[PDB]
Amino acid sequence: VIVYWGSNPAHAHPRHMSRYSIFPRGFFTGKGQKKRTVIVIDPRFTDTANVADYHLQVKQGHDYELFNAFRMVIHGHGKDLPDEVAGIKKETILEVAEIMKNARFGTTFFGMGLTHTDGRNHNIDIAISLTRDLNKISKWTIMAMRGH
Amino acid sequence: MHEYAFFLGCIAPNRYPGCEASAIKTSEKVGIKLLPLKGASCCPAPGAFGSIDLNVWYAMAARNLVLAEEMKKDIALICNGCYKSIWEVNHILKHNDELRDNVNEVLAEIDMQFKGTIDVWHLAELYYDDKVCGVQKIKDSVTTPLSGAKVAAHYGCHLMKPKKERHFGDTENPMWFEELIGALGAEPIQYRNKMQCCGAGGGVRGYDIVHALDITNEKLINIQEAGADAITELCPFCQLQFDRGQIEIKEKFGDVYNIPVLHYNELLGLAQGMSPQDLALDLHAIDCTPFLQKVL
Amino acid sequence: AFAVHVNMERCTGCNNCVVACPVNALELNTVNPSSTDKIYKVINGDAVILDVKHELCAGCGICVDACPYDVIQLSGQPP
Amino acid sequence: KTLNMITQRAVEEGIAMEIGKTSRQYFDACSIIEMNEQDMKELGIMKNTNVRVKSESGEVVVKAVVGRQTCYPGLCHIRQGVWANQVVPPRTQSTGAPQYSGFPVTVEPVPNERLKTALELVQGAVGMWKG
Amino acid sequence: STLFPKYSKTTDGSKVIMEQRLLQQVNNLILDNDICTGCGICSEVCPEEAISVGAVGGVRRGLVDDAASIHVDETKCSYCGVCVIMCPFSALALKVDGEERLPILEKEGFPTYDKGTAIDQDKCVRCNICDDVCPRDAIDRDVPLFEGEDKEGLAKGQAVELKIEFKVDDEKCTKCGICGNLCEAINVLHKPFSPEIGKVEGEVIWDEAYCDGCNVCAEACPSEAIKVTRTVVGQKKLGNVNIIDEDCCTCRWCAINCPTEAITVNKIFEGEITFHAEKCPGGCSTCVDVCPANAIYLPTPKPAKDMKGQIEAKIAVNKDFCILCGACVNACPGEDIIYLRRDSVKIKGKETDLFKKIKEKLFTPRTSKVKEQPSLAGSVELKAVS
Ligand SMILES: Nc1nc2c(c(=O)[nH]1)N[C@H]1C(S)=C(S)[C@@H](COP(=O)(O)OP(=O)(O)OC[C@H]3O[C@@H](n4cnc5c(=O)[nH]c(N)nc54)[C@H](O)[C@@H]3O)O[C@H]1N2
Ligand code: SF4
Ligand code: SF4
Ligand code: SF4
Ligand code: SF4
Ligand code: SF4
Ligand code: SF4
Ligand code: SF4
Ligand code: SF4
Ligand code: SF4
Ligand code: SF4
């Protein structure tokens, strides 16, 4: 599973997808893209979202509430979510969360969507908390989309 | 990036400068480089000047040709009348020896010789050719769809006729210019007698304005009946006729159409994202604002 | 044996049309590779189709579905 | 009207800067608003026309276009660069990262006004505009 | 020249309509591009060699617009209609004047496929599995829709034939609305209140068409007035389930998965298909995307602590569901991952020399190919296996 939270590899890092994340056929991923689930979260419908298989079009600035929703789902009593969170609908939240739980080895990438909005570092550290929580039942690894 | 000398006759630079500006910008966006012609003048306008004196028509067109000959480049044009003058005098003087001789001993008084080494192209012809930018390349360059607009094409007469003297094929119902408008995303419509003259050629525009305007009004009636929202054209003469003549028709007759008239280069600029201010659409007699509301 | 056309004007060199083509993936990713010819290679930042004579494509649509900013048009009709 | 706004990247923008920060390519690539079609209609902005983007920490005249990357109703976007940073507010929230994405702004359709080049913008903000 | 043999080929929406005009007689070979599956059983069979196969994967995925799965040279086609009879999923139709009309069948000059569908309505139970698993939209469960997903077809309690009796104590009917303030069967009518009596008095009316053995309203009665009972009369089978026969493709999915073995389908083709998994270049699930009968799968990667040194296969097939169509072979961009060979077509109608030729054409083994010849660019050419 690959999550591009608040990032846009197609225009920021062009050959990121074709070199490291999605399209290369690895060793344990010989089937290539076709067994990778790509989730892209950002308010725009970016080119990364075009290539993706999911898209969680979130209100700009509400990523903290989104992360908190995900983490309540993961911690188990996700029924206490409101009807919708950050513009994202609870059933879609549960869908993506189930995929994340069942991931054999996940990876989250983040960028300006998290480091340049309200709660600059608290967005990132709630993301890191989410990763540390997911490593309870799966293997998940945050990773920052460094620029230069 | 192919390079051509840009002839730029009288009406585009001095009445519709947005046409030439969009020509340069859009041609550069596709793989074409339009170089200024150094001291070019009026192509001796084929009607108003050929009707007076064919020998001075030949001499002035040959001078315009030898400017680009010294530049060592191929002429590119955006006017059907300028195409007639430049291309046809080039073709005639490439084959008629006594006319070469006469023009050369006229030009020798200004230290200048014609040898016939270059070729003349219309910009729409280049946009249509496949070696140079093709229809697919135009479609690629288009960034604003211009969808949901009915657009009527006026071919003009001096580009395609007579077919025994040109190489563009059928003159009865050509569709090549309709493909360039379809590339932009606008749907080209067909109207009655689409190959009719606009009426401005041959100096009739000046000699008998009512006669010329009646010929134009026949076209405008057919185009409105079809349901066009603009008229694309490949000639600044025809654009001037369809633009001024709508106002003169509104005053001399009682007919109102308010149909914007745009050069194909202006539509190509609109498709590629140029601004209406950067195209100087405020310099047309007929307001383009309804068409802009539709396509924007 | 179809024909693919790449709009050079909006190609970014992303190389996800090269990596995703299943005819390109034949050489290094197959047991006993059959054919080692390649449709695309990104030369000077844009995807160039070496398959000039339209002999290797199979109209799969993996490359059209891969390019992030649609720029590859697949022609299913004889060239 | 309040019209929340973000500032982000584009390949044409990266291409442009590596051609050169003072180049026509950079001008064309960065002087751009990419807003929603519904918002453009509601405000009254003609496609491909200059517009006045005026936040609490500045102002800039920028071309107004529509972007493929579909901004939902109520969002704006400038490709990052000279023009965007003419209007970005400097608030950092004690983190050193200015509010580069998510600041309110008002948009006023103002055609017939030119765009300011990169050199003119910066050298005139500082007071060095010789030309 | 002469004009009136007007040959036209128009793409009217999703139907590619291929036509031959005369003054009063027309000929319309109509291909429904939403049902074509990219098999070539229309190109192998064409007596006049006009139908060619196009970008199967792209068209079947939606990424191609200016073409269909197949191209028919309507100048060469003879409008025999052999393609319409021999297409397993009926995505080709012949209309002579304005009506679907097959002269060769009208004269009995050609056998037809024996899909042999049937659903013994004395065994089917209105289950929903056969409609759910059927890859092609071709199983019709004619069944009133009960409370599941809709308003009751008859009622939850009339989906079964039961026997129930309800009785009350007029002696203890306080006539509070609780009995019908719960069930939709109980409707209490309070006839108008008049000081004559100075009391409340009405009636409790119970309808069979809505009850159940729920018995909640017995104790929802404040005063104990109510009683009830139940049991089934045999069998219910409300409606019928049967197979559309011009759409079914002999997959055996619904027969293999029917709960009561009430479906009788026989595959039209017989043979064997093999997948050399070690030659699939990974991320090319075109075969999976274009298989009509969804026989193909990507074998799911095992978890860790379960791989046991065997890594995974890249592609495989289910011979139980493969119908030997050929879309997989026509779509694969690989070299020889797939091997297809049909051995026997099952028909009704006697035979013909033409049909023996068509059998010989359909029964030659085939496999994919890379780098076919350029002179035929725009179509598919497979490998002839010895
Ligand atoms: N061509 C080009 N490439 C570059 C750069 C360049 O300037 N030009 N810059 C380089 C450098 S310096 C950088 S740091 C990297 C970084 O580049 P990235 O980290 O990948 O981020 P961006 O490209 O700016 O796009 C960020 C995405 O997050 C979305 N977003 C905005 N607000 C929010 C929000 O509140 N929530 C969520 N979930 N998403 C939001 C934005 O819409 C955008 O889609 O790129 C590098 N690559
Ligand atoms: S259609 Fe398939 S085989 Fe052809 S170039 Fe694209 S990915 Fe390669
Ligand atoms: S995937 Fe698209 S953008 Fe990337 S190199 Fe290929 S054609 Fe160009
Ligand atoms: S389903 Fe197969 S046989 Fe029928 S028309 Fe389509 S390609 Fe031909
Ligand atoms: S109708 Fe007969 S000749 Fe025409 S395409 Fe079908 S099989 Fe071929
Ligand atoms: S699967 Fe069998 S039992 Fe169930 S509805 Fe279909 S035919 Fe009837
Ligand atoms: S709830 Fe009981 S007491 Fe009331 S009307 Fe019904 S049966 Fe009579
Ligand atoms: S037994 Fe149940 S279903 Fe029947 S009338 Fe009473 S409450 Fe209603
Ligand atoms: S027999 Fe197979 S193909 Fe036919 S309807 Fe039943 S499940 Fe579908
Ligand atoms: S698995 Fe069988 S049904 Fe599916 S495409 Fe291959 S031959 Fe056709
Ligand atoms: S069998 Fe063909 S379609 Fe399937 S993965 Fe291999 S090459 Fe791709």
The ligand minimizing its distance to the Cα of C12 is 3
Determination technique for this PDB entry? cryo-EM
How many Å apart are CA B239 and CA B248, to the nearest integer? 14
Q: Is C67 in the pocket of ligand 3 (CB under 6 A)?
A: yes
Q: What are the Cα distances from residue B133, in Å, to B139, B167, E30?
A: 10, 18, 37
Q: Is B141 on the interface with C (CB under 8 A)?
A: yes
Minimum Cα–Cα distance from B140: chain C residue: C7
Question: What are residue B74's DSSP bridge partners?
Answer: B4
Q: Find all residues with CB under 8 Å of E335, minimum gap 6, and list them.
A: C26, C34, C35, E279, E368, E369, E370
Using CA atoms in the order D116, D122, D123, D124, what is the torsion angle rounded to 10 degrees?
60
Chains D and B touch, contact meaning at least 3 pairs of CB atoms under 8 angstroms apart = yes
Q: Which atom in ligand 3 lies closest to the alpha carbon of residue C70?
A: 2
Q: Find all residues with CB under 8 Å of E347, minimum gap 6, and list them.
A: E111, E112, E113, E114, E355
Q: Which residue do the tokens 């409340």 mark?
A: E200
Q: Is E292 on the interface with C (CB under 8 A)?
A: no
Give the Cβ contact number of residue B78 at 10 Å.
27
Contacts of A31 in chain E (CB under 8 A): 282-283, 298, 301, 312, 314
Q: Using the 8-state DSSP alphabet, how is residue B194 labeled?
A: T
How many Å apart are CA D47 and CA D49, to the nearest integer? 6
Alpha-carbon Rg of chain A, whole angstroms?
14
Q: Tell me how long chain C is.
A: 79
Q: Is E315 in the pocket of ligand 11 (CB under 6 A)?
A: yes
Give the Cβ contact number of residue A89 at 10 Å.
12
Burial class (CB in 10 A: 0-12, 13-18, 19+), D112: exposed
Q: B133, B31 in Cβ contact below 8 A?
A: yes
How many Å apart are CA B62 and CA B93, to the nearest integer? 8
Q: Is E382 on the interface with C (CB under 8 A)?
A: no
Contacts of A117 in chain D (CB under 8 A): 101-102
- For chain D, give the longest Cα–Cα distance: 42
Give the nearest partner residue to A35 out of E301, E303, E311, using CB atoms: E301
Strands (DSSP E) found in E35-114: 51-53, 70-72, 92-95, 112-113
How many Å apart are CA D14 and CA A73, to the nearest integer? 39
How many Å apart are CA B288 and CA B126, to the nearest integer? 27
Question: What are residue C46's DSSP bridge partners?
Answer: C43
Alpha-carbon Rg of chain C, whole angstroms?
12
Our CA angle for A126, A129, A130, nearest 5°, is 90
Chain C residues at the B interface, defined by Cβ less than 8 Å, are 5, 7-10
SS3 assignment, position E193: coil
Q: What are the Cα distances from residue B85, in Å, to B69, B77, B96, B161, E171?
A: 16, 11, 16, 13, 115
Nearest C-alpha to atom 5 of ligand 11 is from which residue? E284
Q: Which atom in ligand 9 lies closest to the alpha carbon of residue E138?
A: 5
Q: D129, D120 in Cβ contact below 8 A?
A: yes
Minimum Cα–Cα distance from A139: chain E residue: E304
Chains A, C: CB contacts under 8 A, how many?
A: 46
User: Pairing mode, if any, of strands B2-6 and B32-36?
Assistant: parallel
Q: Which residue do the tokens 């003072």 mark?
A: D22
How many Å apart are CA E301 and CA A36, to the nearest integer? 11
SS3 assignment, position B266: helix
Alpha-carbon Rg of chain D, whole angstroms?
14
SS3 assignment, position E313: coil
Give the Cβ contact number of residue E111 at 10 Å.
20
Burial class (CB in 10 A: 0-12, 13-18, 19+), B147: exposed
Burial class (CB in 10 A: 0-12, 13-18, 19+), E316: middle
SS3 assignment, position E308: coil
Nearest C-alpha to atom 7 of ligand 2 is from which residue? C21
- Region B2-123: CATH code: 1.20.1050.140
Q: Before B162, cis peptide (omega within 30)? A: yes
Q: Which atom in ligand 10 lies closest to the alpha carbon of residue E251?
A: 3
Q: Which residue do the tokens 């007929």 mark?
A: B286
Q: Tell me how long chain A is.
A: 148
Q: From ligand 6's centre to the CA of E111, what distance in Å?
A: 30
Give the Cβ contact number of residue A28 at 10 Å.
13
Helix axes A90-102, A63-75, angle to 10 degrees: 60
Q: B219, B210 in Cβ contact below 8 A?
A: no
Give the nearest partner residue to C15 out of A15, A32, A47, using CB atoms: A15
The residue among D106, A72, C31, C1 whose CA lies nearest residue E282 is C31
Q: A110, A124 in Cβ contact below 8 A?
A: yes
How many Å apart are CA B213 and CA B205, to the nearest integer? 8
Q: Which residue do the tokens 């929703």 mark?
A: A69
DSSP labels, D21-54: TTSHHHHHHHS-EEE-HHHHHHHTPPSSEEEEEE
Check D100 against A116: CB less than 8 A apart. Answer: yes
Interface test with A, best of C19, C27, C31 (most A CBs within 10 A): C19
Burial class (CB in 10 A: 0-12, 13-18, 19+), D101: buried
The structure tokens listed for E244 are: 């559309």
- Half-sphere exposure of residue B27: CA atoms within 13 angstroms, side-chain side: 26
Minimum Cα–Cα distance from A103: chain E residue: E303
- Chain-centroid distance of CA B142 in Å reads 21
How many Å apart are CA A67 and CA A74, to the nearest integer? 10
How many Å apart are CA C41 and CA C50, to the nearest integer? 7
Put residue B30 in one of left, alpha, beta given phi > 0 → left and psi -120 to 50 → alpha.
beta
Chains B and C touch, contact meaning at least 3 pairs of CB atoms under 8 angstroms apart = yes
C14 in a labelled binding site: yes
Write a three-state SS string for A35-59.
HCCEEEECCCCCHHHHHCCEECCCC
Q: How many structural domains compose chain C?
A: 1
How many Å apart are CA B41 and CA B10, to the nearest integer? 8
Q: E37, E325 in Cβ contact below 8 A?
A: yes
How many Å apart are CA E42 and CA E162, to the nearest integer? 54
Check D47 against B277: CB less than 8 A apart. Answer: no
- Half-sphere exposure of residue E359: CA atoms within 13 angstroms, side-chain side: 17
Q: D35, D2 in Cβ contact below 8 A?
A: no
Q: Which residue do the tokens 């044996």 mark?
A: C1
- Half-sphere exposure of residue E121: CA atoms within 13 angstroms, side-chain side: 12
How many Å apart are CA B44 and CA B36, to the nearest integer? 19
Burial class (CB in 10 A: 0-12, 13-18, 19+), A19: middle
- For chain B, give the longest Cα–Cα distance: 57
Give the nearest partner residue to A115 out of D70, D72, D97, using CB atoms: D97
SS3 assignment, position A142: strand
Q: Find all residues with CB under 8 Å of A84, minimum gap 6, and list them.
A: A90
Q: Which residue do the tokens 């200016």 mark?
A: E66
Structural element, H or E, at residue E331 = helix E327-331
- Enclosing domain of residue D54: 1-131
The ligand minimizing its distance to the Cα of C38 is 2
Q: From ligand 11's centre to the CA of E335, what distance in Å?
A: 9
Question: What are residue E94's DSSP bridge partners?
Answer: E29
Q: C24, E333 in Cβ contact below 8 A?
A: no
Q: One-letter amino acid identity for D79?
A: R
The residue among E174, E208, E196, E343 whose CA lies nearest residue E268 is E343
SS3 assignment, position D76: strand
The structure tokens listed for C20 are: 């995703």
- Chain-centroid distance of CA E242 in Å reads 12
How many Å apart are CA E202 and CA E211, to the nearest integer? 21
SS3 assignment, position A134: helix
Q: B276, D48 in Cβ contact below 8 A?
A: yes
- Chain-centroid distance of CA B172 in Å reads 19
Q: Using the 8-state DSSP alphabet, how is residue E263 labeled?
A: B
Q: Which atom in ligand 9 lies closest to the alpha carbon of residue E293?
A: 3
Q: What are the Cα distances from residue E45, in Å, to B236, E342, E358?
A: 59, 14, 6
Q: Is E378 on the interface with C (CB under 8 A)?
A: yes
Helix axes B264-272, B17-29, angle to 10 degrees: 50
- Enclosing domain of residue C79: 1-79
Q: Which atom in ligand 6 lies closest to the alpha carbon of residue E126?
A: 5
How many Å apart are CA B240 and CA B209, to the nearest integer? 13
Q: Tell me how long chain E is.
A: 386
Q: Using the 8-state DSSP alphabet, how is residue A79 labeled?
A: G
How many Å apart are CA E295 and CA E293, to the nearest integer? 5
How many Å apart are CA A139 and CA A108, to the nearest integer? 11
Interface test with A, best of E61, E285, E288, E305 (most A CBs within 10 A): E285
How many Å apart are CA B18 and CA B22, to the nearest integer? 6
Check D63 against B274: CB less than 8 A apart. Answer: no
How many Å apart are CA C3 and CA C22, to the nearest integer? 15
Q: Is A116 on the interface with D (CB under 8 A)?
A: yes
Q: Which residue do the tokens 């219309």 mark?
A: B122
Q: Which atom in ligand 4 lies closest to the alpha carbon of residue E35?
A: 1
The residue among A114, A95, A97, A103 whose CA lies nearest residue A141 is A103
How many Å apart are CA C31 and CA C25, to the nearest integer? 11
Q: What are the Cα distances from residue E79, in Å, to D82, E27, E37, E51, E93?
A: 67, 7, 21, 12, 10
Q: From ligand 2's centre to the CA of C40, what distance in Å?
A: 9
Main-chain phi, psi angles of E181, to 5 degrees: -85, 5
- Half-sphere exposure of residue A55: CA atoms within 13 angstroms, side-chain side: 16
Handedness of CA E259, E264, E267, E270 (dihedral sign): positive
Give the Cβ contact number of residue E166 at 10 Å.
19
- Half-sphere exposure of residue A147: CA atoms within 13 angstroms, side-chain side: 9
Q: A39, A52 in Cβ contact below 8 A?
A: yes
- Chain-centroid distance of CA A111 in Å reads 11
The residue among B235, B234, B233, B250 whose CA lies nearest residue B285 is B250
The residue among E159, E161, E166, E160 whose CA lies nearest residue E217 is E166
How many Å apart are CA B51 and CA A76, to the nearest integer? 92
Q: Using the 8-state DSSP alphabet, how is residue E276 labeled?
A: -
Question: What are residue B201's DSSP bridge partners?
Answer: none
Main-chain phi, psi angles of B214, to 5 degrees: -65, -40
Q: From ligand 10's centre to the CA of B118, what distance in Å?
A: 61
How many Å apart are CA A60 and CA B182, to the nearest integer? 39
Strands (DSSP E) found in B59-144: 74-77, 120-122
The structure tokens listed for C42 are: 């990104």
How many Å apart are CA C53 and CA C43, to the nearest integer? 19
The structure tokens listed for E200 are: 């409340």
Strands (DSSP E) found in E284-353: 338-345, 347-348
The residue among B64, B83, B26 whose CA lies nearest residue B237 is B83
Check A30 against E282: CB less than 8 A apart. Answer: yes
Handedness of CA E330, E332, E336, E342 (dihedral sign): negative
C73 in a labelled binding site: no
Q: How many structural domains compose chain D?
A: 1
Handedness of CA B219, B220, B226, B231 (dihedral sign): positive
Check B292 against D48: CB less than 8 A apart. Answer: no
Burial class (CB in 10 A: 0-12, 13-18, 19+), B164: exposed
Contacts of A1 in chain E (CB under 8 A): none
SS3 assignment, position B177: helix
Contacts of A18 in chain C (CB under 8 A): 14-16, 18-20
